[PDB]
């Protein structure tokens, strides 16, 4: 079709300041900073105006699979804005039958050492992506909490745990055992 442009904008609150080197975006905020390069995605970005901080992503030329990626851009900025002010917290809970899951942390809140999963002798050590924090819950049974700024480093690491607790050579519809994610939240609440 080759339409004339589309554009979404992303409003920026005051404690976070987005600066851009190009199609690379640098996001500094209160609880750290993080950056993403979009040198594959063929769009211009424009932060415009002092004292209000609006980011304008627009694509002038394009087709229907090139128009679909202008929202994917602006929805990745809002995960960089939300994660650098609030952060991400994926609470996940252990579900077990007869055998209780023994889950500890070896290395400074990075390595996760899972044993006594389904009565097996084999420990399952999970080393995580750099930028998340491991923490066994308090005032709750068998809950594991991951905290960090960047969603794709939180969420991929929360996927490695759930994938490691995979029941093999069995009926997966019974034998419902695993450390499944149960909540998608923030580190700081209600801002």
């Amino acid at each position: 079709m080759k339409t004339i442009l589309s554009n979404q904008t992303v409003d920026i609150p005051e404690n976070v300041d987005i600066t851009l080197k190009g199609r690379t975006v640098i996001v500094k905020g209160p609880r750290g900073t993080l950056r993403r390069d979009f040198n594959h995605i063929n769009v211009e970005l424009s932060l415009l105006g002092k004292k209000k901080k609006r980011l304008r992503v627009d694509k002038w030329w394009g087709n229907r699979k090139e128009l679909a990626t202008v929202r994917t851009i602006c929805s990745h900025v809002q995960n960089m804005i939300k994660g650098v002010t609030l952060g991400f917290r994926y609470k996940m809970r252990s579900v077990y039958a007869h055998f209780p899951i023994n889950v500890v942390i070896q290395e400074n809140g990075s390595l996760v050492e899972i044993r006594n999963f389904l009565g097996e002798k084999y420990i399952r050590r999970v080393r995580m992506r750099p930028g998340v924090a491991c923490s066994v819950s308090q005032a709750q049974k068998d809950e594991l909490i991951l905290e960090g700024n960047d969603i794709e480093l939180v969420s991929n690491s929360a996927a490695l745990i759930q994938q490691a607790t995979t029941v093999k050579n069995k009926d997966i519809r019974k034998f419902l055992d695993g450390i499944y994610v149960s909540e998608k939240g923030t580190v700081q609440q209600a801002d």
């Binding site: 080759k2 211009e44 424009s46 002038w60």
Partner: protein, 139 residues
């Protein structure tokens, strides 16, 4: 990023084609790759030139959407594009590119003798600034 657009009234240079080397005024974009243009004060009349033919310049003209030749003629010489186009650094480069093409054999000799002269002058002078640059760094 994208500091100059096409637009109703945008002055464009025409690089190749049947009107190669003349300015035009973009009047109406017609479909996606073809634009209605004219130049009333630069000897190119009204037609649809393709966009890959043209070169965007940085002069805009505030005339209405798809007017006649007359109002574009008024806006061309109210804004006085032709003196502003001569007094730019890019039409000096296309002026300079044709002066070098019509350089005769006798002038090309005279350029050669006056080129190899002044490059002696700088080389016998740029050596002096090297000579004083170590003389700072020797104490």
């Amino acid at each position: 990023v994208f500091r100059r657009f096409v637009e109703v009234g945008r002055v464009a240079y025409v690089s190749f084609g049947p009107h190669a080397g003349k300015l035009v005024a973009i009047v109406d974009v017609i479909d996606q790759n073809r634009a209605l243009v004219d130049g009333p004060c630069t000897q190119v009349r009204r037609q649809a030139m393709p966009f890959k033919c043209m070169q965007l310049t940085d002069f805009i003209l505030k005339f209405p959407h798809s007017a006649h030749q007359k109002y574009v003629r008024q806006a061309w010489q109210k804004a006085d594009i032709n003196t502003k186009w001569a007094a730019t650094r890019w039409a000096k480069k296309i002026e300079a590119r044709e002066r070098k093409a019509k350089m005769t054999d006798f002038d090309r000799f005279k350029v050669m003798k006056a080129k190899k002269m002044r490059n002696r002058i700088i080389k016998n002078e740029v050596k002096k600034l090297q000579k004083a640059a170590l003389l700072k760094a020797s104490p």
